[PDB]
Design a protein around this ligand. Structure first.
Ligand SMILES: COc1cc2[nH]c(C(=O)N3C[C@@H](Cn4cnc(N)c5ncnc4-5)c4c3cc(O)c3[nH]c(C(=O)N5CCc6c5c(O)c(OC)c5[nH]c(C(=O)SC)cc65)cc43)cc2cc1O
Ligand SMILES: [Ca+2]
Length: 227
DNA sequence: AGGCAAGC
DNA sequence: TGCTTTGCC
């Protein structure tokens, strides 16, 4: 049972605003891996805002406590809310929190939580601490955990001109022979996105290095008409 | 406001 | 495959 007063307040307020008619299709969309209360993103964020306006944002010493307690609640909106909360503490998040973020990635894993952790929170940490990438990314690739592998692929997704091209291509080469949908698809996504910034090097990469056909097709869907 | 981004 | 609905930017 959650014990932090902020989490208890949030749980009560979310539960009081549940919508069972939305809960069923929301849970089906995530392959019924999770129960849902039936609260979509606009309403979920406003309910969190209500609780912050009443109680104020808890002290930064508590932010991991709060996120952990929310992660253990059954309904999926509590994990989505915990990530909204983590965004409000981002000035206090640094390299010492990478293991905490790893834990969140591999606990109650699915594409919604993992994608909300990786390009923003890990992306920002490794921009400030790029000399720490080698302590994590190769480990994640070798772990055979598909969500840490997707993290290795997508932490640079929002980098645009900051992208470390040789690193991106090494990561992708290490994972290109994965059978896994969420890995093949992440490779396609990150290549398509980076092609918005540096289309010529993505084209050269895709024409000279092996990729699953899903990955290759997705990578080039916007630039192929230029060649 | 609208374009671009899993499910089946 | 290319349409769905909702979410991110
Ligand atoms: C950094 O850069 C980016 C990060 C990004 N994150 C997301 C994202 O996180 N997405 C996009 C979008 C999921 N999504 C939707 N449409 C598409 N066409 C998509 N293509 C891919 N994903 C897609 C989505 C999430 C996350 C979620 O946690 C989501 N949850 C739902 C959802 O819950 N859905 C979608 C389908 C659906 C619901 C839902 O609530 C419902 O509740 C009623 C639904 N009812 C029905 C029906 O009765 S139809 C017969 C369908 C239905 C959508 C959804 C997009 C995105 C974009 C970026 O550039
Ligand atoms: Ca698609």
């Amino acid at each position: 049972v959650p014990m932090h007063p902020f989490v208890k307040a949030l749980q009560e307020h979310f539960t009081a605003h549940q919508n069972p008619e939305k809960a069923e299709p929301m849970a089906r969309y995530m392959k019924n891996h999770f129960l849902f209360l039936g609260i979509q993103t606009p309403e979920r964020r406003q309910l969190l805002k209500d609780i912050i306006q009443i109680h104020t944002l808890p002290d930064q010493k508590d932010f991991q406590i709060i996120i952990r307690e929310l992660w253990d609640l059954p309904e999926r909106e509590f994990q989505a809310a915990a990530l909204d909360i983590m965004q409000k503490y981002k000035k206090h998040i640094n390299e010492t929190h990478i293991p905490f973020l790893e834990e969140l990635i591999v606990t109650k894993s699915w594409w919604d939580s993992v994608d909300s952790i990786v390009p923003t929170f890990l992306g920002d940490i490794f921009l400030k601490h790029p000399e720490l990438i080698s302590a994590y990314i190769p480990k994640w690739i070798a772990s055979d955990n598909i969500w840490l592998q997707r993290a290795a692929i997508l932490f640079q997704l929002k980098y645009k001109q900051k992208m470390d091209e040789e690193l991106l291509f090494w990561i992708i080469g290490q994972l290109h022979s994965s059978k896994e949908f969420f890995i093949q698809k992440a490779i396609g996504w990150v290549l398509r996105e980076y092609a918005k910034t540096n289309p010529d090097v993505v084209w050269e990469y895709v024409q000279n290095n092996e990729l699953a056909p899903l990955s290759k097709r997705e990578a080039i869907k916007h630039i192929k008409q230029n060649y």
